[PDB]
Structures are given as structure tokens and as C-alpha cells.
Amino acid sequence: MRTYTFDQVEKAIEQLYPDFTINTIEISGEGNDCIAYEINRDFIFKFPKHSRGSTNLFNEVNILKRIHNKLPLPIPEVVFTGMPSETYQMSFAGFTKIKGVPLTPLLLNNLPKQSQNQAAKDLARFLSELHSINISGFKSNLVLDFREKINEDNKKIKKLLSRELKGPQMKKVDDFYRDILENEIYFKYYPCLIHNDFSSDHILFDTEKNTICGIIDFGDAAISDPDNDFISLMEDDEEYGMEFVSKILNHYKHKDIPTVLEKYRMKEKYWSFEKIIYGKEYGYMDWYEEGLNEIRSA
Ligand SMILES: NC[C@H]1O[C@H](O[C@H]2[C@H](O)[C@@H](O[C@H]3O[C@H](CO)[C@@H](O)[C@H](N)[C@H]3O)[C@H](N)C[C@@H]2N)[C@H](N)C[C@@H]1O
Ligand SMILES: [Cl-]
Numbered sequence: 001m002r003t004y005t006f007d008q009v010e011k012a013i014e015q016l017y018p019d020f021t022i023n024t025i026e027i028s029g030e031g032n033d034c035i036a037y038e039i040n041r042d043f044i045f046k047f048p049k050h051s052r053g054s055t056n057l058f059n060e061v062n063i064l065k066r067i068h069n070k071l072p073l074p075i076p077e078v079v080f081t082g083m084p085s086e087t088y089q090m091s092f093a094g095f096t097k098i099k100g101v102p103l104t105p106l107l108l109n110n111l112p113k114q115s116q117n118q119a120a121k122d123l124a125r126f127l128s129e130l131h132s133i134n135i136s137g138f139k140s141n142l143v144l145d146f147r148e149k150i151n152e153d154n155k156k157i158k159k160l161l162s163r164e165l166k167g168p169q170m171k172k173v174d175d176f177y178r179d180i181l182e183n184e185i186y187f188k189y190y191p192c193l194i195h196n197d198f199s200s201d202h203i204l205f206d207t208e209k210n211t212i213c214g215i216i217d218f219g220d221a222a223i224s225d226p227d228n229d230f231i232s233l234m235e236d237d238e239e240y241g242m243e244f245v246s247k248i249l250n251h252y253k254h255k256d257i258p259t260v261l262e263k264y265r266m267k268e269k270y271w272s273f274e275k276i277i278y279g280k281e282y283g284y285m286d287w288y289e290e291g292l293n294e295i296r297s298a
Pocket of ligand 2: 121
């Protein structure tokens with residue numbers, strides 16, 4: 001977990017962009033992978049906090065260059081790039097700022113119905129076009145096969161928790177994985193390009209027009225199940241809930257809604273294990289401790 005000063009930020013940019021004068025700078029945001037700085041109040045510069053987050057950022061830059069004029073909404077436009085080292089695949093990236101605020105569930109629910117419905121329509125169109133992008137050209141590395149992922153997660157959890165769980169608890173963990181892996185519905189899909197972190201904090205909104213004006217944070221994008229981009233919005237607490245996503249599904253012409261509901265339900269059940277595994281890979285020990293404690297009360 002690297003941190004940066006404004007000076008280190010400026011120096012790093014100046015080396016590669018000497019003719020770009022920096023007038024203003026301040027932290028605009030911070031995620032699990034990068035800190036973001038607002039330079040000149042007209043450009044968002046992401047710096048990785050660790051190597052994994054830099055690989056994320058490298059992925060983001062590379063996907064955005066392939067899809068930059070293929071979508072019905074604005075997306076982050078890469079303007080500045082950093083360099084690789086032995087530690088980071090990309091030392092930083094600078095993007096054009098997209099004005100707007102996140103379309104939070106609270107904001108969405110306070111909109112006139114007609115504007116809510118237009119938001120579901122515009123999200124559907126964006127997903128339908130995104131999931132229809134021809135991926136024949138793309139890197140095969142981007143393919144995230146869900147059956148391989150779940151099998152690998154089972155092995156990681158065994159590896160992580162072998163000495164933390166009593167034998168009968170570990171058997172029950174093994175049962176859970178074995179059960180998930182015998183259900184074909186989770187692993188039979190037609191892979192396409194997916195945003196893969198398609199949640200409300202990555203949907204920007206223009207409160208003057210009451211319309212969606214951007215989709216951001218493509219660092220998790222990959223070629224996997226397109227249903228991923230609906231289930232990320234179905235959570236009642238931090239996301240839009242079932243009523244609204246069912247509007248999105250209807251505009252998208254989804255043919256198998258009860259499968260999306262089944263995938264959401266399993267994902268919800270899977271969260272304790274995602275916290276254990278993501279906790280360790282992204283070095284968040286509280287995520288890891290909380291999931292481990294959920295499992296001991298399974
Ligand atoms: N905070 C508690 C919630 O955390 C997760 O969702 C949240 C995800 O954690 C958020 O995603 C973030 O965390 C995930 C890992 O969970 C990373 O893969 C992703 N790059 C990062 O942006 C995502 N963008 C929003 C979503 N509601 C759980 N899926 C649901 C849980 O209620
Ligand atoms: Cl319509």
C-alpha cells in the first residue's frame with residue numbers, strides 16, 4: 001500500500017509530459033486499486049496503490065482503447081499514460097474528467113418515474129451494446145471462465161483455511177463448492193465483453209438533464225457471463241434492487257430472467273468466500289477476518 005504526495009504525482013507526470021503544466025491538484029477519490037487525483041479540475045489521474053491495482057489499471061487502459069467509440073454513453077477517455085517497472089505494469093493513467101455525480105439508489109428513487117424509466121432504458125442499451133461488441137480481436141487472457149474460477153477458489157479456500165477451520169466445518173465448505181459446481185446454470189453462458197463491476201457508484205448522472213452521462217471504472221472488465229452486469233445492480237442495500245433491474249432486463253430483451261435471479265442468489269451466498277479470497281489478494285485483513293467469522297457460523 002503505496003501512498004503519494006502531490007509532489008511525487010507532479011514529478012511522475014512531468015517526466016513523461018513535460019509540456020503539460022499542472023496548475024491545480026487534489027485527491028478526487030480512492031478505491032481498492034488506485035487513488036485518483038483531480039489535476040487542473042479537468043482530468044482524473046489514477047495512481048496504483050499496489051502492483052495488483054496497477055495491473056487493474058493497465059487492463060482498464062487497454063480495454064478503453066478498444067471500445068472508445070463503440071458505446072451509447074461516455075466512458076473514460078485515456079489522455080496520459082505512465083510506464084511499466086519491476087513493480088507496476090503502469091505507473092499512472094490520466095483520463096478526461098466526466099462531469100456528473102453517481103446515480104445512487106437514493107437519487108434514482110427520488111427521480112420522476114419517467115426519468116427512472118429512461119435510466120433503466122439507457123442502462124439496458126449500454127449493456128446490450130457492450131455485450132454485443134465483437135470480441136474476436138481481443139486478448140484471450142481477458143476470458144474469465146466462471147467454472148475455472150470457482151474451482152480455483154475452492155482450492156484457495158482449502159489452502160487458506162485448512163488450519164483455521166475444524167474438519168467438519170471444512171467438509172461443509174467442500175459441500176458448498178461441490179453443490180455450486182454440479183449446477184450447470186452458473187457456467188453455461190455465451191461469453192462476451194462485460195464491465196464486471198457494473199454498480200451504482202460507476203454510473204454517473206447529470207442532475208440538470210436527469211439523465212445518465214457516463215459509465216466509469218473499467219478495471220475489472222473481462223470476457224465472461226453478461227449476467228454479471230445485472231446481478232451487480234440487484235443488491236437492495238448498496239444497489240438498485242429487483243424492481244428496477246427487471247426494467248433493465250425487459251429493455252435488454254433478457255430471455256431467462258429466473259436464471260439471473262438464481263445467479264444473484266448464489267453470488268449473495270458466495271460473498272463470505274469472496275471476502276476471504278479478495279481480502280488476501282487485495283491485502284484487506286478485515287474483509288478476510290469477517291468472512292472467516294461468517295463461515296464459522298455457516
Ligand atoms: N460493501 C458490502 C457489499 O460489498 C460487495 O458489493 C460491492 C462491491 O464490493 C464493490 O466493488 C468493489 O469491490 C469488489 C470486491 O467485492 C472489487 O472486485 C471491485 N473492483 C471494487 O470496486 C461494487 N462496485 C459495489 C458493490 N455493492 C458485495 N458483492 C455485496 C456487499 O453487500
Ligand atoms: Cl421502450
